Amino acid sequence: THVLRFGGIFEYVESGPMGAEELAFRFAVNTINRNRTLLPNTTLTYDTQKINLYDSFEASKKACDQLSLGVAAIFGPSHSSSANAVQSICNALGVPHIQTRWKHQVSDNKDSFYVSLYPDFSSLSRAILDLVQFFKWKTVTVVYDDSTGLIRLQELIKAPSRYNLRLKIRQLPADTKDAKPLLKEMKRGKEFHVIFDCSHEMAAGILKQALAMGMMTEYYHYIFTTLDLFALDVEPYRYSGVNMTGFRILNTENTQVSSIIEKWSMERLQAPPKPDSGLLDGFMTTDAALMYDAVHVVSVAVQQFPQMTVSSLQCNRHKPWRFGTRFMSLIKEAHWEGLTGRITFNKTNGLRTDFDLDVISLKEEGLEKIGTWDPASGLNMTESLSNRSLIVTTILEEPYVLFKKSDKPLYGNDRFEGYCIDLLRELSTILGFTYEIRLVEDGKYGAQDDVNGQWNGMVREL
Amino acid sequence: GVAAIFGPSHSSSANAVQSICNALGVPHIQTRWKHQVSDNKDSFYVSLYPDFSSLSRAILDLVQFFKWKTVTVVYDDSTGLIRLQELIKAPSRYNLRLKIR
Ligand SMILES: *[C@@H]1O[C@H](CO)[C@@H](O)[C@H](O)[C@H]1NC(C)=O
């Protein structure tokens, strides 16, 4: 059988023996060759190196060392800076490159030897806009971890030009977790709708600090554009009363996906996640799922490309790789499906813009799925009585409605008294009424506001 | 035989050359604005283009001095919003009506 090794450049760490992306790559590599369903007459192999993800020169060195040997494909690092150098090297030598974590793509860079399994942030931003349209919001507060968040989410920022929205963008300071000034500023603006554009670890941390600030009220609504929001411990938030909504691509509601996540949680028993950090345990991180799907679709493409003789392309001198064109084409229209649901590549760019999304909202139960988002269909939100309570609202005027003048605190509908109260009593004893008296929360009459026509009291209560 | 480097005027190319120069120790004296990743730990380099933090807040100073109420920012491509961050965050602390196009 054919033997091919996929050049891998993953994170170098010292606390954990090997990085989660490295675990995903190794697991999928040993799974594909083991399972004769994929690659029956071809044996898998790999070549994993370690970089700091910032010294792009050393990443280039590792990539050059890999290409000096036979490499089937390059699975570039998950950094927003070093990946550019690796993809440039791959394009120069005509070798396929498969990113997994999103990076900014220079619109003036004409490189056709790279793909990005991470859903394109333009599509995700459009989905966020569609969801906010479904929520009819007016005041929003977008927050980002890195400055790249502005690039990641721009469609919603432009939206107030298209629609009647309003934005107030604030930044999470670096090298700190002091969200308290940011949250205090949020209260000073009464920004009940807030969007958190940060990774799931930072999202969980800032959620913990918000709960410690008592930000889990019903009035506050949260959206987390990250795809690992499901992996947060919603146990303190199951009864917090938040209407939080989020997105998901890991199609956990599948037998094969459940088996894979269970096996992966079994494998990662060496470095358990810290329980006292607001993070769940035994779950598939979205980046690992993307790496899994990326290597699987590469395997699917090379299934249709049996002639996969590798070479020893150098960096001291450059030479085009003869198998790049058609193999990368097969990569581009490799329509395989896995943990992230549907996987396909927009042939115009290579960034996946057509992908399933699990719309996730928070209720009493933990992170229910309230529908599905698709690029073609936009947002797909689908989801008298004899013993009917007769709720009424009334204002306390002594000639009309006065509380029962009893020293003992009276309960039930008997505590209410007056002309209107007894008139309602007569209506209930004449007609069929399950009468109950509820005091008006506004305490004032319906006033025609010149600002927005906002009523109050009985009018806006009805 | 070199003792200094003047990198290209571009994000990715200058980033790569800066990393190479840091590894080799020679300075990489870039002359064009680029977005350094906030967690970058490189030293041997310097940029002369006015960083869009003092210049962005200078645009903010112009906005306040002109006393605008309805500002409509317009940019060129993705790496422009990441560059005028202070102007984007200004409406939180003041009265602005950014409708970005
Ligand atoms: C939308 O979701 C519903 C179930 O929630 C499903 O029956 C339907 O096929 C989906 N698509 C469309 C276009 O309605």
Coordinates of C-alpha atoms and ligand atoms in Angstrom, one line a residue:
Chain A
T1 CA 0.0 0.0 0.0
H2 CA 1.0 3.6 -0.5
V3 CA 2.7 5.3 2.4
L4 CA 2.2 9.1 2.7
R5 CA 3.0 11.5 5.6
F6 CA 1.2 14.8 6.2
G7 CA 3.6 17.5 7.3
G8 CA 2.3 18.9 10.6
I9 CA 3.4 22.1 12.4
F10 CA 1.6 22.4 15.7
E11 CA 2.1 24.2 19.0
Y12 CA 5.1 23.5 21.2
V13 CA 4.1 23.2 24.9
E14 CA 5.7 22.1 28.1
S15 CA 2.8 21.8 30.6
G16 CA 1.0 19.3 28.5
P17 CA 3.1 16.7 26.7
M18 CA 1.4 17.6 23.4
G19 CA -1.1 20.1 22.2
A20 CA -4.8 19.5 21.7
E21 CA -4.5 20.1 18.0
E22 CA -1.6 17.6 18.0
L23 CA -3.9 15.1 19.8
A24 CA -6.6 15.6 17.2
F25 CA -4.2 15.2 14.3
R26 CA -2.7 12.0 15.8
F27 CA -6.1 10.6 16.6
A28 CA -7.5 11.1 13.2
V29 CA -4.3 9.8 11.5
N30 CA -4.4 6.6 13.5
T31 CA -8.2 6.4 12.9
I32 CA -8.2 6.8 9.1
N33 CA -5.6 4.1 8.4
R34 CA -7.1 1.8 10.9
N35 CA -10.6 2.1 9.5
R36 CA -10.6 0.4 6.0
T37 CA -13.7 2.5 5.1
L38 CA -11.2 5.4 4.3
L39 CA -7.9 4.7 2.6
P40 CA -8.0 0.9 2.3
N41 CA -5.0 0.4 0.0
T42 CA -2.9 3.2 1.4
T43 CA -1.1 3.6 4.7
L44 CA -1.1 6.9 6.6
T45 CA 1.9 8.5 8.2
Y46 CA 2.8 11.9 9.5
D47 CA 5.7 14.2 10.4
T48 CA 5.0 16.5 13.4
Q49 CA 7.3 19.4 14.4
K50 CA 7.1 21.9 17.2
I51 CA 7.1 25.7 16.9
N52 CA 6.4 28.7 19.2
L53 CA 3.7 29.9 16.7
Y54 CA 5.3 33.4 16.8
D55 CA 8.8 33.0 15.4
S56 CA 7.6 32.7 11.8
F57 CA 11.1 32.2 10.7
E58 CA 11.4 29.0 12.7
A59 CA 8.0 27.8 11.4
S60 CA 9.4 28.4 7.9
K61 CA 12.5 26.4 8.9
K62 CA 10.4 23.5 10.0
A63 CA 8.3 23.7 6.8
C64 CA 11.4 23.7 4.7
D65 CA 12.8 20.7 6.7
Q66 CA 9.5 18.8 6.1
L67 CA 9.5 19.6 2.4
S68 CA 13.1 18.4 2.1
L69 CA 11.6 15.1 3.0
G70 CA 8.6 13.6 1.2
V71 CA 5.4 15.3 2.5
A72 CA 1.9 14.5 1.3
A73 CA 0.5 17.8 2.5
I74 CA 1.2 20.6 5.0
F75 CA -1.3 21.2 7.9
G76 CA -0.2 24.6 8.9
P77 CA -0.1 26.1 12.4
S78 CA -3.1 27.6 14.1
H79 CA -1.7 31.2 14.4
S80 CA -2.9 34.3 12.7
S81 CA 0.7 35.4 11.8
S82 CA 3.0 32.5 11.2
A83 CA 0.4 30.7 9.0
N84 CA 0.9 33.4 6.4
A85 CA 4.6 32.4 5.9
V86 CA 3.8 28.7 5.8
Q87 CA 1.1 29.2 3.2
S88 CA 3.4 31.4 1.2
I89 CA 6.0 28.7 1.2
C90 CA 3.5 26.0 0.3
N91 CA 2.3 28.2 -2.7
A92 CA 5.8 28.9 -3.8
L93 CA 6.6 25.2 -3.9
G94 CA 3.1 24.3 -5.1
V95 CA 2.3 22.1 -2.1
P96 CA -1.3 22.0 -0.6
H97 CA -1.7 23.7 2.7
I98 CA -4.7 23.1 5.0
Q99 CA -5.3 25.7 7.7
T100 CA -7.6 24.9 10.5
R101 CA -7.8 28.0 12.8
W102 CA -9.1 31.1 11.1
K103 CA -6.7 33.8 10.0
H104 CA -7.0 37.1 8.2
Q105 CA -6.5 36.7 4.5
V106 CA -5.0 39.6 2.6
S107 CA -7.4 40.6 -0.1
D108 CA -4.4 41.5 -2.3
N109 CA -2.7 38.1 -1.9
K110 CA -3.2 35.9 -4.9
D111 CA -2.3 32.5 -3.4
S112 CA -4.0 29.3 -4.7
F113 CA -2.3 26.7 -2.6
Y114 CA -4.2 27.0 0.7
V115 CA -7.5 26.1 2.3
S116 CA -9.2 27.1 5.5
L117 CA -11.6 24.6 7.2
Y118 CA -12.6 27.2 9.8
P119 CA -15.9 28.8 8.7
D120 CA -15.3 32.1 7.1
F121 CA -15.9 34.9 9.6
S122 CA -17.8 36.9 6.9
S123 CA -20.4 34.1 6.9
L124 CA -20.4 33.9 10.7
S125 CA -20.9 37.6 10.9
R126 CA -23.8 37.4 8.4
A127 CA -25.3 34.7 10.6
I128 CA -24.9 36.9 13.7
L129 CA -26.6 39.7 11.8
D130 CA -29.5 37.4 10.8
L131 CA -29.9 36.2 14.4
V132 CA -29.9 39.8 15.8
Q133 CA -32.5 40.6 13.1
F134 CA -34.5 37.7 14.5
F135 CA -34.0 39.2 18.0
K136 CA -35.0 42.8 16.9
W137 CA -32.2 44.3 19.0
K138 CA -31.5 48.1 19.1
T139 CA -28.4 48.6 21.4
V140 CA -25.4 46.3 21.2
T141 CA -21.9 46.2 22.7
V142 CA -19.4 44.2 20.7
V143 CA -16.3 43.1 22.7
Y144 CA -13.2 41.4 21.2
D145 CA -10.2 39.7 22.7
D146 CA -7.6 40.6 20.0
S147 CA -7.6 43.5 17.7
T148 CA -8.3 41.0 14.9
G149 CA -11.9 40.8 16.1
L150 CA -12.7 43.9 14.2
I151 CA -11.6 42.1 11.0
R152 CA -13.5 39.0 12.1
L153 CA -16.8 40.8 12.7
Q154 CA -17.5 43.7 10.3
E155 CA -20.9 43.0 8.8
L156 CA -22.7 43.8 12.1
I157 CA -20.5 46.9 12.4
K158 CA -21.7 48.1 9.0
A159 CA -25.3 47.1 9.8
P160 CA -26.3 50.4 11.5
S161 CA -25.9 52.0 8.1
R162 CA -28.2 49.4 6.5
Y163 CA -30.7 49.2 9.5
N164 CA -31.8 51.1 12.6
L165 CA -29.3 49.4 14.9
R166 CA -26.7 51.0 17.3
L167 CA -23.3 49.8 18.4
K168 CA -20.8 50.7 21.2
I169 CA -17.7 48.6 20.7
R170 CA -15.4 48.1 23.7
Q171 CA -12.1 46.3 24.1
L172 CA -11.0 43.6 26.6
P173 CA -7.6 44.8 27.7
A174 CA -4.7 42.4 27.1
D175 CA -2.6 40.6 29.8
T176 CA -5.4 41.0 32.3
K177 CA -8.8 39.6 33.3
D178 CA -10.1 42.9 34.8
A179 CA -13.5 42.9 33.0
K180 CA -15.0 44.8 36.0
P181 CA -14.3 48.3 34.6
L182 CA -15.8 47.2 31.3
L183 CA -18.9 45.7 33.0
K184 CA -19.3 48.9 35.1
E185 CA -19.2 50.9 31.9
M186 CA -21.8 48.5 30.5
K187 CA -24.2 49.3 33.4
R188 CA -23.5 53.0 32.9
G189 CA -24.8 52.6 29.4
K190 CA -27.6 50.1 30.4
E191 CA -26.4 47.9 27.5
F192 CA -28.7 44.9 28.0
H193 CA -27.5 43.2 24.8
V194 CA -23.8 42.4 24.7
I195 CA -21.7 40.3 22.2
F196 CA -18.5 38.6 23.3
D197 CA -16.1 37.8 20.5
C198 CA -13.5 35.8 22.4
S199 CA -12.3 32.2 22.7
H200 CA -14.2 29.8 24.9
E201 CA -11.6 29.9 27.7
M202 CA -11.7 33.7 27.9
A203 CA -15.4 33.6 27.4
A204 CA -15.8 31.3 30.4
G205 CA -13.5 33.4 32.5
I206 CA -15.3 36.6 31.7
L207 CA -18.7 34.9 32.3
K208 CA -17.4 33.9 35.7
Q209 CA -16.4 37.4 36.5
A210 CA -19.8 38.7 35.2
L211 CA -21.7 36.2 37.4
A212 CA -19.5 37.4 40.3
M213 CA -20.7 40.9 39.4
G214 CA -24.3 39.6 39.2
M215 CA -24.6 40.0 35.4
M216 CA -26.8 36.9 35.0
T217 CA -30.0 38.8 35.3
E218 CA -32.9 38.2 32.9
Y219 CA -32.5 41.7 31.4
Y220 CA -29.0 41.0 30.1
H221 CA -28.8 39.1 26.8
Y222 CA -25.5 37.6 25.6
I223 CA -24.2 36.2 22.3
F224 CA -20.9 34.4 22.0
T225 CA -19.7 34.1 18.4
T226 CA -17.2 31.4 19.4
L227 CA -18.1 27.9 18.3
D228 CA -17.2 26.2 21.7
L229 CA -19.8 28.0 23.7
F230 CA -21.5 24.6 24.3
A231 CA -18.5 23.6 26.3
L232 CA -19.2 26.0 29.1
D233 CA -20.5 25.0 32.5
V234 CA -24.1 26.3 32.3
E235 CA -24.9 24.7 35.6
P236 CA -24.7 28.0 37.5
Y237 CA -26.5 29.5 34.4
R238 CA -29.2 26.9 34.0
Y239 CA -31.3 28.7 36.6
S240 CA -29.6 32.1 36.3
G241 CA -32.4 33.3 33.9
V242 CA -30.3 34.5 31.1
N243 CA -31.7 34.5 27.5
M244 CA -28.2 33.9 26.1
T245 CA -27.9 32.6 22.6
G246 CA -25.0 31.1 20.7
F247 CA -23.8 29.3 17.6
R248 CA -22.4 25.8 17.2
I249 CA -20.9 23.7 14.3
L250 CA -19.9 20.5 16.1
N251 CA -22.9 18.3 15.3
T252 CA -22.9 16.5 18.6
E253 CA -26.4 15.2 17.8
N254 CA -25.0 12.3 15.8
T255 CA -24.0 8.7 16.6
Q256 CA -20.6 8.8 14.9
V257 CA -19.9 12.3 16.4
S258 CA -20.8 11.0 19.9
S259 CA -18.6 8.0 19.5
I260 CA -15.7 10.2 18.3
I261 CA -16.0 12.7 21.1
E262 CA -16.3 9.8 23.7
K263 CA -13.2 8.2 22.3
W264 CA -11.3 11.5 22.3
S265 CA -12.3 12.2 25.9
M266 CA -11.1 8.7 26.7
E267 CA -7.8 9.5 25.1
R268 CA -7.2 12.8 26.8
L269 CA -7.0 11.5 30.4
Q270 CA -3.4 12.7 30.9
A271 CA -4.0 16.5 31.2
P272 CA -7.5 17.0 32.6
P273 CA -9.0 20.4 32.2
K274 CA -9.0 22.5 35.4
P275 CA -12.4 22.0 37.1
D276 CA -12.2 25.4 39.0
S277 CA -12.1 27.5 35.8
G278 CA -15.7 27.6 34.5
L279 CA -14.9 25.1 31.8
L280 CA -16.5 21.7 31.1
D281 CA -14.6 18.4 30.7
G282 CA -14.5 15.6 28.2
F283 CA -15.5 17.6 25.2
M284 CA -14.3 18.3 21.6
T285 CA -12.7 21.7 21.2
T286 CA -13.9 23.3 18.0
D287 CA -10.3 23.7 16.7
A288 CA -9.6 20.0 17.2
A289 CA -12.9 19.1 15.4
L290 CA -11.8 21.4 12.5
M291 CA -8.4 19.6 12.4
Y292 CA -10.2 16.2 12.4
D293 CA -12.5 17.3 9.5
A294 CA -9.5 18.8 7.6
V295 CA -7.4 15.7 7.7
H296 CA -10.5 13.6 6.9
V297 CA -11.4 15.6 3.8
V298 CA -7.7 15.5 2.7
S299 CA -7.9 11.7 3.0
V300 CA -11.1 11.7 1.1
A301 CA -9.5 13.8 -1.7
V302 CA -6.4 11.6 -1.9
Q303 CA -8.7 8.6 -2.1
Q304 CA -9.6 9.8 -5.6
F305 CA -5.9 10.7 -6.1
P306 CA -4.0 7.4 -5.7
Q307 CA -0.9 8.6 -7.6
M308 CA 0.6 10.5 -4.6
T309 CA 4.4 10.1 -5.1
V310 CA 6.1 12.6 -2.8
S311 CA 9.4 14.4 -3.6
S312 CA 12.2 16.3 -1.9
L313 CA 11.4 19.9 -2.8
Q314 CA 14.0 22.3 -1.2
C315 CA 14.0 25.9 0.0
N316 CA 17.5 26.8 -1.1
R317 CA 16.2 26.5 -4.6
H318 CA 12.5 26.4 -5.5
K319 CA 10.7 24.1 -7.9
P320 CA 7.0 23.6 -8.6
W321 CA 5.3 20.4 -7.5
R322 CA 3.7 18.6 -10.3
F323 CA 0.8 17.1 -8.4
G324 CA -0.4 20.3 -6.9
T325 CA -3.1 21.5 -9.3
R326 CA -5.5 18.5 -9.7
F327 CA -4.9 17.2 -6.1
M328 CA -5.8 20.6 -4.7
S329 CA -8.8 20.7 -7.0
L330 CA -10.0 17.4 -5.5
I331 CA -9.4 19.1 -2.2
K332 CA -11.5 22.1 -3.2
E333 CA -14.5 20.0 -4.2
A334 CA -14.0 17.3 -1.6
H335 CA -17.6 17.4 -0.2
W336 CA -17.1 15.1 2.9
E337 CA -19.1 15.4 6.1
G338 CA -17.9 14.9 9.7
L339 CA -17.9 16.5 13.1
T340 CA -18.6 20.0 11.8
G341 CA -21.6 18.7 9.7
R342 CA -21.2 19.8 6.1
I343 CA -17.7 20.5 4.7
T344 CA -17.2 22.3 1.4
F345 CA -14.8 24.8 0.0
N346 CA -15.8 28.0 -1.8
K347 CA -13.8 27.5 -5.0
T348 CA -13.5 31.3 -5.4
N349 CA -11.4 31.7 -2.2
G350 CA -11.0 28.3 -0.5
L351 CA -12.5 29.5 2.7
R352 CA -15.5 27.4 3.8
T353 CA -18.6 29.7 3.5
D354 CA -21.2 26.9 3.1
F355 CA -21.5 25.0 6.4
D356 CA -24.1 23.8 8.9
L357 CA -24.6 25.7 12.1
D358 CA -26.4 24.7 15.3
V359 CA -28.2 27.7 16.7
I360 CA -27.9 27.4 20.5
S361 CA -29.9 29.3 23.1
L362 CA -29.8 29.1 26.9
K363 CA -32.9 28.2 28.9
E364 CA -33.7 26.1 32.1
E365 CA -32.2 23.1 30.3
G366 CA -28.6 23.3 29.2
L367 CA -27.9 24.9 25.8
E368 CA -30.9 23.7 23.8
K369 CA -30.7 24.0 20.0
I370 CA -33.4 26.3 18.7
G371 CA -32.9 25.8 15.0
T372 CA -30.3 25.8 12.2
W373 CA -28.6 28.4 10.1
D374 CA -27.6 27.8 6.5
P375 CA -26.0 30.1 3.9
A376 CA -28.7 29.4 1.4
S377 CA -31.6 29.5 3.8
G378 CA -30.3 32.2 6.1
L379 CA -31.7 31.7 9.6
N380 CA -34.2 28.8 10.0
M381 CA -36.1 29.6 13.2
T382 CA -39.1 27.3 13.3
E383 CA -39.3 25.7 16.8
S384 CA -60.5 29.4 24.7
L385 CA -59.6 27.8 28.1
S386 CA -62.1 27.3 30.8
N387 CA -59.4 27.3 33.5
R388 CA -57.8 30.6 32.3
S389 CA -56.5 33.1 34.8
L390 CA -58.3 36.5 34.6
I391 CA -55.4 38.8 35.2
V392 CA -56.4 42.5 35.7
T393 CA -54.4 45.6 36.3
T394 CA -55.6 48.6 38.4
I395 CA -54.2 51.6 40.2
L396 CA -54.7 52.2 44.0
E397 CA -57.2 55.1 44.4
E398 CA -58.9 55.0 47.8
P399 CA -62.4 56.0 46.3
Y400 CA -61.8 53.3 43.6
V401 CA -59.3 50.7 44.8
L402 CA -57.9 50.5 48.4
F403 CA -56.1 47.7 50.2
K404 CA -58.3 46.0 52.8
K405 CA -57.9 48.1 55.9
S406 CA -57.2 45.1 58.2
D407 CA -54.4 45.0 60.8
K408 CA -53.9 41.3 59.9
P409 CA -52.3 41.1 56.5
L410 CA -55.0 39.8 54.2
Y411 CA -54.2 37.5 51.3
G412 CA -55.9 36.4 48.1
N413 CA -58.2 38.7 46.1
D414 CA -59.8 39.8 49.4
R415 CA -56.9 42.1 50.3
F416 CA -58.1 44.4 47.4
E417 CA -61.1 46.6 48.1
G418 CA -62.9 49.5 46.6
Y419 CA -65.4 50.4 43.9
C420 CA -63.4 48.8 41.1
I421 CA -62.6 45.8 43.2
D422 CA -66.2 45.1 44.1
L423 CA -67.3 45.8 40.5
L424 CA -64.9 43.1 39.4
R425 CA -66.2 40.9 42.1
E426 CA -69.8 41.4 40.8
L427 CA -68.6 40.7 37.3
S428 CA -67.0 37.5 38.4
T429 CA -70.1 36.4 40.3
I430 CA -72.3 37.3 37.4
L431 CA -70.2 36.0 34.5
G432 CA -67.7 33.2 34.3
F433 CA -64.5 34.8 35.5
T434 CA -61.4 33.4 37.3
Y435 CA -60.7 36.9 38.6
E436 CA -57.4 37.9 40.1
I437 CA -56.1 41.4 40.9
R438 CA -52.5 42.3 40.0
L439 CA -51.2 45.7 40.9
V440 CA -49.8 47.8 38.0
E441 CA -46.1 47.7 38.0
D442 CA -45.7 51.1 36.3
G443 CA -48.0 52.8 38.8
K444 CA -48.9 55.5 36.3
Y445 CA -51.5 55.9 33.5
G446 CA -50.8 55.5 29.8
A447 CA -48.8 58.5 28.7
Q448 CA -48.3 59.3 25.0
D449 CA -44.5 59.7 24.9
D450 CA -43.3 62.1 22.2
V451 CA -40.0 60.1 21.9
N452 CA -41.3 56.7 20.8
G453 CA -45.0 56.6 21.6
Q454 CA -44.2 54.3 24.6
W455 CA -47.2 53.8 26.7
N456 CA -47.2 52.7 30.4
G457 CA -49.5 51.3 33.1
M458 CA -52.6 49.7 31.8
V459 CA -52.1 50.5 28.1
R460 CA -48.6 49.0 27.7
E461 CA -49.6 46.4 30.3
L462 CA -52.3 45.2 27.9
Chain B
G1 CA 27.5 41.5 4.5
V2 CA 24.6 43.5 6.0
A3 CA 23.9 45.3 9.3
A4 CA 20.4 46.5 8.8
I5 CA 17.2 45.6 6.8
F6 CA 14.4 47.7 5.4
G7 CA 11.4 45.4 5.0
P8 CA 8.7 45.5 2.4
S9 CA 5.6 47.7 2.6
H10 CA 3.1 44.9 3.4
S11 CA 1.6 43.1 6.3
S12 CA 2.6 39.5 5.7
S13 CA 6.0 40.0 4.0
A14 CA 7.2 42.5 6.6
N15 CA 6.0 40.2 9.4
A16 CA 8.0 37.3 8.0
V17 CA 11.1 39.4 7.4
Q18 CA 10.8 40.9 10.9
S19 CA 10.7 37.4 12.4
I20 CA 13.7 36.4 10.3
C21 CA 15.6 39.5 11.4
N22 CA 14.8 38.9 15.1
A23 CA 16.0 35.3 14.7
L24 CA 19.3 36.5 13.1
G25 CA 19.4 39.6 15.3
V26 CA 19.9 42.2 12.5
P27 CA 17.4 45.1 12.7
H28 CA 14.4 45.2 10.3
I29 CA 13.7 48.9 10.0
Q30 CA 10.2 48.8 8.5
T31 CA 8.7 51.9 6.9
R32 CA 5.0 51.1 6.6
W33 CA 2.2 50.5 9.0
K34 CA 1.6 46.8 9.7
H35 CA -0.6 45.1 12.3
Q36 CA 1.7 43.4 14.9
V37 CA -0.1 40.6 16.6
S38 CA -0.8 41.8 20.2
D39 CA 1.1 38.8 21.6
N40 CA 4.2 39.2 19.5
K41 CA 7.5 39.1 21.4
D42 CA 9.9 40.4 18.8
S43 CA 12.3 43.2 19.6
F44 CA 14.8 43.9 16.7
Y45 CA 12.7 46.1 14.6
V46 CA 11.1 49.6 14.6
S47 CA 8.4 51.3 12.5
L48 CA 8.4 54.9 11.5
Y49 CA 4.9 55.2 10.1
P50 CA 2.8 57.0 12.8
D51 CA 1.1 54.2 14.7
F52 CA -2.6 54.4 14.3
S53 CA -3.1 54.9 18.0
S54 CA -1.8 58.4 18.4
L55 CA -3.0 59.2 14.9
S56 CA -6.3 57.6 15.4
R57 CA -6.8 59.5 18.6
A58 CA -5.7 62.6 16.7
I59 CA -8.6 61.9 14.3
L60 CA -10.7 61.7 17.5
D61 CA -9.3 65.0 18.6
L62 CA -10.3 66.5 15.3
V63 CA -13.8 65.0 15.7
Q64 CA -14.3 66.5 19.1
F65 CA -12.8 69.9 18.1
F66 CA -15.1 69.9 15.1
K67 CA -17.9 68.9 17.5
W68 CA -19.5 66.4 15.2
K69 CA -22.6 64.4 16.0
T70 CA -23.1 62.2 12.9
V71 CA -19.8 60.6 11.8
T72 CA -19.7 58.2 8.9
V73 CA -16.4 56.4 8.8
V74 CA -15.3 54.9 5.4
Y75 CA -12.3 52.6 4.9
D76 CA -10.6 50.6 2.2
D77 CA -10.3 46.9 3.2
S78 CA -10.3 44.6 6.2
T79 CA -7.0 45.8 7.7
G80 CA -8.4 49.4 8.1
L81 CA -11.0 48.7 10.8
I82 CA -8.3 46.9 12.9
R83 CA -6.2 50.1 12.4
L84 CA -8.6 52.8 13.5
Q85 CA -9.6 51.0 16.7
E86 CA -9.7 54.1 18.8
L87 CA -12.1 55.9 16.4
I88 CA -14.3 52.8 16.6
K89 CA -14.3 52.7 20.4
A90 CA -14.8 56.5 20.7
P91 CA -18.7 56.5 20.7
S92 CA -18.7 54.6 24.0
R93 CA -17.1 57.5 25.9
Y94 CA -18.7 60.4 23.9
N95 CA -21.6 61.2 21.6
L96 CA -20.9 59.8 18.1
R97 CA -23.1 58.2 15.4
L98 CA -20.7 55.9 13.5
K99 CA -22.4 54.3 10.6
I100 CA -19.4 52.6 9.0
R101 CA -19.4 51.8 5.3
Ligands
LIG1 C1 -36.1 24.4 9.2 O1 -36.2 23.6 10.4 C2 -37.4 22.8 10.5 C3 -37.4 22.2 11.8 O2 -37.0 23.1 12.8 C4 -37.3 21.7 9.4 O3 -38.4 20.9 9.4 C5 -37.1 22.4 8.0 O4 -36.9 21.4 7.0 C6 -35.9 23.4 8.0 N1 -35.8 24.1 6.7 C7 -36.7 24.9 6.2 C8 -36.4 25.5 4.9 O5 -37.8 25.1 6.8

